[PDB]
Amino acid sequence: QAEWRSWEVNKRLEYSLVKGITEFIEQDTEEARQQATRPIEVIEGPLMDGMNVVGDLFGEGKMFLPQVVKSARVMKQAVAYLEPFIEASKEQGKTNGKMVIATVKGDVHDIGKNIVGVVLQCNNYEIVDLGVMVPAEKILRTAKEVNADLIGLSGLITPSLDEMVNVAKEMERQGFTIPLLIGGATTSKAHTAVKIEQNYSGPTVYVQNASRTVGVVAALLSDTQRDDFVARTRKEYETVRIQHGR
Amino acid sequence: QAEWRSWEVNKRLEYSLVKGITEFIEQDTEEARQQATRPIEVIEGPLMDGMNVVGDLFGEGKMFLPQVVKSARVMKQAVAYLEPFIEASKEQGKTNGKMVIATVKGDVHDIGKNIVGVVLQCNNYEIVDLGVMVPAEKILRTAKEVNADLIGLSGLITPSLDEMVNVAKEMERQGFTIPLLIGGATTSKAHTAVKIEQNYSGPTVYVQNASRTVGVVAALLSDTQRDDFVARTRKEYETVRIQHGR
Ligand code: COB
Ligand code: COB
């Protein structure tokens, strides 16, 4: 075995990602699977780190698109393997809610819009994923028609941030009332507080990652928790504008 | 059911911090130590989570200062217990660099300025911690006298942010060139890129936490990694301003 093939499973995952090696992903993911308490952990641990580095190497031009593209296929393959180990974890239960999630317009990144989808799914919620590059009006038309309890927007490229600010305003125009969930690698609480929220009277909660989304969605949907959380949050967003020199 | 004294060690930790109980902190921390790969994990895991809760309760007026102060005593007691286990963890052989770290003016929070210090130390770096509430002038004077290869500012309250921006400016005035590291609970990369960096020609890198500081200090000091890392960083902060409507 090549020396790399002897490193720590976690260090082997990262390598595979970077290099775009699809030959050992499954057997590596599985080994990593058995060590973690929860499948989601391998995804948000090793796998994500691996994608981070890929991100960087690409950013410093030490990596190119055709390569990040091979790295994505490996990530994709790794997630795919875990997916049933996730869905086996959801006994009984019906539905706690429903969310129309979608990668904003101009953006084709979805690897994450998906992990959050698969997670909320095995948590008993219905996720109508509109896909990548979906237009604001098609976001709302579906949110209405399906009667979603929330809407999640994913965004990874700079311009996306604006499409988010935009569907926030558009939602308000149609006088929506459902909590807006924002996320995606290039999304920060700062921007969500500073540039997104203000454009909408309903809750707009920036959530950092998939596993933490379940926590918000429950709150946003709990008759007890709702009003408090939404305030705590609104007040937290009030502070950050203060700091950024409003 | 019964008393806290039967819960998960991690769950017993979080409690002790909230209530300010110092009777089982060492005994408990030890149990937590034997489960983590590295001591730093408990400090950045349970302990931090407890202190987060504490902050919150204080913020919601559900907890008062004389209580957050006792919680501090416990957190402090837990770290202390851990320190030698950290020191007995690594010593390599000699100094890699030198850093003057200090908690900004009018700020007295320091439980983190220290953890980052104790981490950096066992990794073979010399740290001259100027303490809390240190004025810009004294930071620079020491930075020069001691010929530090970096400077670290810790800040946990809103006003501190401004002092950070201030010492960035002041460093530029004395035409410094060492990299400036920003950190602290109320420190964000957004504010770091939007309001701090611009004021200084040398590197201004915001590090999320102590453990991750090692990985930056190393780059900042590597002949190889240096110019790239510093460029990737700068460019990253360039984008964040752009999203922030700048
Ligand atoms: C698991 C997932 C891993 N993350 C990743 O999957 C993305 C990785 C990576 C390396 C980017 C680096 C990076 N910084 O991550 C880089 N890409 Co891409 C090179 N890219 C690709 C890949 C996408 C494939 C796919 N279908 O995903 C492509 C090769 C096609 C690709 C394409 C582009 N990419 C481009 C760019 C430059 C970038 N790419 C990035 C996003 C990045 C950040 C890299 C960089 N640094 O330069 C660039 C964006 C910079 C910017 N600020 O604009 C670009 C423009 C390149 C090009 N063609 O030249 C092009 C854009 C296409 C477009 N029209 O939009 C990839 C793979 C990447 O994490 P995540 O953060 O997305 O999800 C995470 C998760 C945790 O589970 O759930 C969360 N979440 C996310 N969505 C939601 C939520 C949470 C809630 C509550 C929601 C409601 C929604 C939370 O965010
Ligand atoms: C380990 C450490 C845990 N975090 C903690 O130790 C802080 C906990 C807590 C509960 C705060 C809540 C919170 N959100 O955390 C709250 N404090 Co205190 C109530 N407090 C105290 C405690 C501090 C004692 C001490 N010596 O530490 C005191 C009771 C004395 C205290 C005092 C104040 N506090 C006050 C306030 C309101 C707050 N306090 C906060 C900080 C906070 C955030 C909570 C809140 N929410 O209200 C308030 C500030 C909000 C704001 N935006 O201004 C205040 C004003 C209360 C008063 N007296 O009325 C007062 C300030 C007095 C002053 N002159 O500064 C405490 C304990 C807290 O994590 P950390 O993030 O600091 O370190 C972490 C670590 C990871 O390893 O390394 C990183 N790092 C940090 N520094 C650096 C780096 C990394 C690098 C690269 C660097 C160069 C530097 C990274 O940040």
Curated annotation (Swiss-Prot), chains A, B:
Keywords: Amino-acid biosynthesis, Cobalamin, Cobalt, Metal-binding, Methionine biosynthesis, Methyltransferase, Repeat, S-adenosyl-L-methionine, Transferase, Zinc. GO terms for cellular component: cytoplasm; cytosol. Signal peptide: none annotated. Residues 96-231 form the B12-binding domain. Methylcob(III)alamin binds at E44, G106, D107, V108, H109, D110, S154, T158, A210. GO terms for molecular function: cobalamin binding; methionine synthase activity; zinc ion binding. Residues 1-94 form the B12-binding N-terminal domain. One of its GO terms (biological process) is tetrahydrofolate metabolic process. Modular enzyme with four functionally distinct domains. The isolated Hcy-binding domain catalyzes methyl transfer from free methylcobalamin to homocysteine. The Hcy-binding domain in association with the pterin-binding domain catalyzes the methylation of cob(I)alamin by methyltetrahydrofolate and the methylation of homocysteine. The B12-binding domain binds the cofactor. The AdoMet activation domain binds S-adenosyl-L-methionine. Under aerobic conditions cob(I)alamin can be converted to inactive cob(II)alamin. Catalyzes the transfer of a methyl group from methyl-cobalamin to homocysteine, yielding enzyme-bound cob(I)alamin and methionine. Subsequently, remethylates the cofactor using methyltetrahydrofolate. L-homocysteine is bound via the zinc atom. Belongs to the vitamin-B12 dependent methionine synthase family. This is Methionine synthase. The gene is metH. The chain holds residues 651 to 896 of 1227 of the full protein.
